Each structure stands twice: as structure tokens, then as C-alpha cells.
Amino acid sequence: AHHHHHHVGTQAFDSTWKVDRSENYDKFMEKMGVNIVKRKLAAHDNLKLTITQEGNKFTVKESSAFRNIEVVFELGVTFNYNLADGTELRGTWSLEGNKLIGKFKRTDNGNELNTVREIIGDELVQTYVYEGVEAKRIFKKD
Template sequence: MTAEMTVDYSGTWDIISNVNFDGYMIALDNDYATRKLAKMLSPQKVIKQEGDSFTIKTVTAFRNYECSFTIGQEFTEVTSGMDNRSCQSVVTWDDNKLVCVQNGQKKNRGWTHWIEEDQLFLELTCENHVCRQVYKRKP
């Protein structure tokens, strides 16, 4: 059975924890003011999944970010809202996890999403920093 048949990422997810976001933003070369503002935000993820095609919107009071991709197909991603860099990204399935590798100016950059019960987990990686976020699905 394929992963997309067993896991449905679609829905609206509210953040409930955010560990080492500052370290991750430092690795992205974000300035102090940007980091301070970003730490005060409570992002919400809105995910639309249709088979292997995804649109993930990150919504905050300050700025929104949208990323659309198809599993296994490389795409050019501009990480507006984070560090505004362009990178070549590809998302693949690893069991029931979505794994994104972002090739660009920063080393070891990417993210992994997975679901456990009614929680969405996100690990953001850049260089030697890992940020761990947890979201809860809205009813």
C-alpha cells in the first residue's frame, strides 16, 4: 500500500510547540528583529492533499507562505517569509513521512512532516540546527 493512501495530511493545523526556531533562523542568517518578530507568531498550516500533489500554506498574522509540489518532482522554491532564497527542492515519501531536501546556498537544508494521531510534526533542518514544531489538527 502506498503512503498517500494511508495518511491524509489535508486539514488545518494550529501550532502547539516550537523548539529551537531561533537557532534555525540564525542558521538562515535572519537578523535579530526578524527572529524576535517570528518567535511571537503562531503559524497555522493549511494543507491540501490530492494523491501525490500537495499545497501547504503557512499562515501568520505577519506573512503567509505557500508551497505546492508533487511527490518525486523537483521544483524551484523561493523561501519567501523565511530567508527569501531560491533552492531546488524535491519531496519524497519515507514510509508515511514527507521528506523535503532543499538544495541551495545553505547546507543540510530541508524538512520532514509526519502525523501521529491528531498531531502534525515538522522538523526543519538547516546546517547544524534542527527546529521541531508540533501542530494539532483543528476539528
């Protein structure tokens, strides 16, 4: 007696999507209290994203008009992330039920930010909620 068989797959998110559009971002940056100049480049930064994962550890490369760095996280591993000005927040991402959670909190007053990751049709999306305001950026393959 004997038998055999085989198949194959291929992830979807593991791609290179660049900022093709955004929604409500204006209120998000305005909320924090960003200056006209800071809102000029942070709006037309041309964020280029590259998604690559190997297990429960994801690594994405992001580049902007004034800088660019690579970040690495782990599902369910809280770590300290620093900002361009030096602020350090304690946050990360973790899946729940059938959705992905992303939360980070300021050290000043503990402002809780909430972000979820999803994909619609042929465009990647990431939502961010700040004080009731829910803004998101739509990245299309580059």
C-alpha cells in the same frame, strides 16, 4: 449466483493545524544569523496550516503576521521555490521506505537542508535539520 459489499476510509493529515508549539527553533533561526527583530515576528508569526491532497500533489495554505501564500508540490517533482527576500532554492518532497523526505538547497553555496514529515498522537510535526541542528514545529488542529 451473485454477491456484493462495500466500505469507506478518511485521511488524517488533511486538516487545519495552527502553530501550537515548537522545539529548538531558537537555534535554527539563530544559526542563520537572524536579527532580534526578524526573530521576533518569525517566532510569533502564528503560522496557520491547512493540509489538503489529491493524489501525489499536495497543497497547503500557510499564513503569517507579515504575509501568507499557498504552495503546491508533487511527490518526486523538483521545482524552484523563492524566499521572502528573493532567494531561490531547488527542492521538494519524496517518500522513501516508510518515511517522507523533504530537501532544499541554497544557490549560494548549496546548503543542504533536510526535513521529515510525521504525526504523533494528535499533533502534527515537521522536523528540519540545519548544520547538525535538528529543530521542529508542532502544529495542533485549529
